[PDB]
Write a protein that binds this ligand. Structure first.
Ligand code: HEM
Ligand code: HEM
Ligand code: HEM
Ligand code: HEM
Ligand SMILES: [Fe+2]
Ligand SMILES: [Fe+2]
Ligand SMILES: [Fe+2]
Ligand SMILES: [Fe+2]
Ligand SMILES: [Fe+2]
Ligand SMILES: [Fe+2]
Ligand SMILES: [Fe+2]
Ligand SMILES: [Fe+2]
Ligand SMILES: [Fe+2]
Ligand SMILES: [Fe+2]
Ligand SMILES: [Fe+2]
Ligand SMILES: [Fe+2]
Ligand SMILES: [Fe+2]
Ligand SMILES: [Fe+2]
Lengths: 156, 156, 156, 156, 156, 156, 156
């Protein structure tokens, strides 16, 4: 079915967000795993899979709407060198993605692409969960301190 | 069966206590859950259910004794902004409820409402358990310190 | 995540509706149970649980959006003294809640709070079911008469 | 296999009957369901499926006999506004269908289309069952009265 | 163990109440069964067993306290000739038994026979349940009318 | 609950679309089955059931909103005489239905009928799947040729 | 453990190959899926997972050897517009990756990084399998022709 061109660009832009998230989260995961922070590796790894599921949905949608998924361009990864910096970087990434999502959803509605919209709201709901998790973790670090926080990540 | 009027007022007053406890405990629970303090969310949530069971018992009793359960008036909730303050507030609530319970039990006995009395003693026994749990938690916070205490609530 | 302030007020107002519904439905339930109308006690009781689930969703959402859930203020309960009056009172309550819900949903959409919106539409769908059930019961009372209707509620 | 042309017209006419029955029964079903008359919704719904099975048999037969099933023309639905009127309308529909069936069966026999005939007799046997059920229900309404009859439909 | 003499007299008086209840309930049960009121036979029969359990408890207690259980004297049975009269008669019986129970419980407490007391409160709690059931049934008779009430007792 | 009149007309119009789809798909199915194209009979048959599920949803919704479902008027079926023509006709039908759906969804939103809207978006999502399937099949016919395509439909 | 710097660069380069393969294969997969070529979607999808497993191994290894995995730079994807072109593009990609792999393996051996070597030989063995599969598919296309080849991909 020929889709609205601007919806397709939005979908590709969103796809673009997912593919930075996929990599940044995956590297973070294995950084944590390396450091022995087993618990944070399990969670970030599973968020990486989450972003992959999202990318797949965009890809199938773009293809269905007869556009070209763009997996060629990769935005800026911001990796960071310690637990806090890296969680904080994932949070900024999620917050930017949510911003773009809110914009795309409004636009899909106004051209009547209600199923692209519905798919995007489901994704947003997931993003909002990722945001909840990062925010809580970052606060726990302050509340219990870094040393206690790290000890808490040792067993899955 | 027509009950003693003053027993009914006592039952309604006690019902009133349960309904503040229900709300205060439920909010506290989801405050803890939000903060990632998973363990305290499980316990307060289950105390919330406990207070609901109590309310139900009062309601069925009042109705049986042919009075009007009053779910309209809600006493003061005292929420508090951090773990200690909030546990401490639940403890004062429990202590006030126990006080009212002791009074009602004595009065039920003197008008021969032994089954209202028996029901109230069972509830009091539960309250006294809630009091035990709050007192222990509050002491643990001092003994192990706030940071260690918080780390201890992360996993259920 | 910091939410839109007006969405939070709406959420608290809706939460407020749920908490009157919870109490009014619960009392009605146990009034029916007392009268031996076993079937109406099962249904209203299960609607009470429904409204509790709703309240919980609002509470977690408000907390997530970083506002203060307000469980302190309780609107007017309208209890009523016989089956019809009481069903009819639940129906007016549901109709008012749906009205507020329609308003909040439109507003969430216009500030792009699509996940609050999505949650609210799911709740509205439940409310609309509660409305269907009340409307049908009230009509059955007229169609079959009050005596036959009551006999019909004796066994669950 | 090339069939007798007039058998095909009969088959299409009968198919036509089934397709009004399908719709009228389905709407009636969901009218009863809406009104809370759960028992009548189950039965009419299952008669709707029955008529669908019949239509399917006609369609496959027409196709086998190399004619064109006509699903384009739809006869008059007569819906009615209350339980009796609506049951009574289904009964007139069944009685008309049986009449057409008796005629087609006789004609199939005389051109030696014995398998069309055999299929039609099986269907007629079903119709005659639907007629039995409507007649009994209509009589029960008089014998027990409308109010008792309605109370009797509340549980499946 | 030698018990307080007056506690023993109370126990025998209460035993006396149970033995009228046993008979009156059993006859009522089989009267209902004869009349085809299957549901009321099941309930009254099970209340008969209940009163037997009570009598047994008194008998074992009296014997333990070294008194003589008196099964010789039987109070007045009041049977009645129709469903209402008979339910109403069971209710007056229960109300009289509860009165005697309240008196005995107070007295046991004041001579420190706390286990006799505890046993009596458990029994009272059962009586109060029997009272609830009779009161509800009697009200259902008025609310739904005698004919509908009787039809409602036909199947267990 | 009294619904918006124009939503009801839309619902009836959409219901109208479903009922042509139901018939056209069912006939197509049994045409394919007759021709031995077993695979296409399974799929179109299951799309027929899909459209039935849709019709049912409209019917229950209209009834709930207190309007009259219209199963009397049947739009134009366009049957076609060979596989391609017939698939292509189903595709035009789906495309027209999606158009009407997009319009109704926008309108439901603006009168705040969010649950009708939610139901319509779910249906649209299904339609969009039916469109995907038809488009793919039509392209496969060109890519692999008609003869290979037909051989491919012989086994389910 | 501090690794040899040049082994780390090789590992990152190889990682780089895997990440183009991951995307190109994933898009190809969903392109085939869209076109209904179900069989080719299953295989390319599973090759995508394969390349992901490879990337993960590089990432964990680089991290272990204390270097920085580079997921930021993405080489050229070459997508192509039809089945042959796209398979042929995957084959060129695999052939280039194998070339780099052969070079890295020889170099790891000469600095005594035998476990990086062992890991690389296992990966190479997988690549060589991917190459086998592409080569066979491309030949099947010529041997059986494009139309027969496409029909052959319709069912998984
Ligand atoms: C105020 C008077 C209330 C009464 C009398 C009441 C009564 C009850 C009862 C009897 C239960 C079942 C307990 C059991 O058998 O395990 C229950 C469950 C529950 N209640 Fe309430 N309730 C009240 C208010 C609330 C409130 C304000 C909330 C907060 C949202 C709430 C949340 C819940 C939840 C989440 C469940 C369990 C549902 C599940 O299975 O997931 N209740 N309630
Ligand atoms: C036009 C209004 C119709 C409505 C609202 C309707 C509704 C339904 C529904 C709800 C089902 C059950 C779906 C499920 O749970 O699997 C069903 C089944 C079915 N329908 Fe229809 N239907 C309609 C017309 C037709 C027509 C014209 C035919 C053609 C003969 C047909 C053929 C069938 C068949 C063969 C089944 C499966 C029954 C079985 O299990 O054997 N329907 N229908
Ligand atoms: C005088 C008229 C009475 C009648 C017609 C009667 C009838 C019955 C019947 C039919 C059973 C059930 C038998 C079975 O199926 O196993 C039963 C059980 C029993 N009866 Fe009686 N009974 C009478 C008096 C009493 C008395 C005075 C006592 C002394 C306390 C007594 C004690 C019991 C006990 C302990 C059971 C067993 C219940 C259980 O399963 O726990 N009954 N009775
Ligand atoms: C960038 C585009 C990518 C897409 C669209 C994608 C897609 C997927 C999907 C759909 C799954 C299976 C999830 C399910 O069960 O449904 C998966 C699994 C997986 N992915 Fe990705 N992926 C991508 C990139 C990556 C990257 C860069 C890595 C890093 C090495 C990676 C690592 C993994 C791993 C380790 C698994 C699971 C393997 C297992 O342990 O069973 N993926 N991917
Ligand atoms: Fe995402
Ligand atoms: Fe995310
Ligand atoms: Fe309590
Ligand atoms: Fe308590
Ligand atoms: Fe609600
Ligand atoms: Fe509600
Ligand atoms: Fe039929
Ligand atoms: Fe029929
Ligand atoms: Fe007793
Ligand atoms: Fe008793
Ligand atoms: Fe449809
Ligand atoms: Fe469709
Ligand atoms: Fe690879
Ligand atoms: Fe490879």
């Amino acid at each position: 079915m020929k889709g609205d061109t601007k919806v397709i660009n939005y979908l590709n832009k969103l796809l673009g967000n997912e593919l930075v998230a996929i990599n940044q989260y995956f590297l973070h995961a294995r950084m944590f795993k390396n450091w022995g922070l087993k618990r944070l590796n399990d969670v970030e790894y599973h968020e990486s899979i989450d972003e992959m599921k999202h990318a797949d949905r965009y890809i199938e949608r773009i293809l269905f709407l007869e556009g070209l998924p763009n997996l060629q361009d990769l935005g800026k990864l911001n990796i960071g060198e310690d637990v806090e910096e890296m969680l904080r970087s994932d949070l900024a990434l999620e917050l930017d993605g949510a911003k773009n999502l809110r914009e795309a959803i409004g636009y899909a509605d106004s051209v009547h692409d209600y199923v692209s919209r519905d798919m995007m709201i489901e994704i947003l709901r997931d993003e909002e969960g990722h945001i909840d998790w990062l925010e809580t973790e970052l606060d726990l670090i302050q509340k219990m301190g870094l040393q206690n926080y790290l000890q808490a990540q040792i067993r899955e």
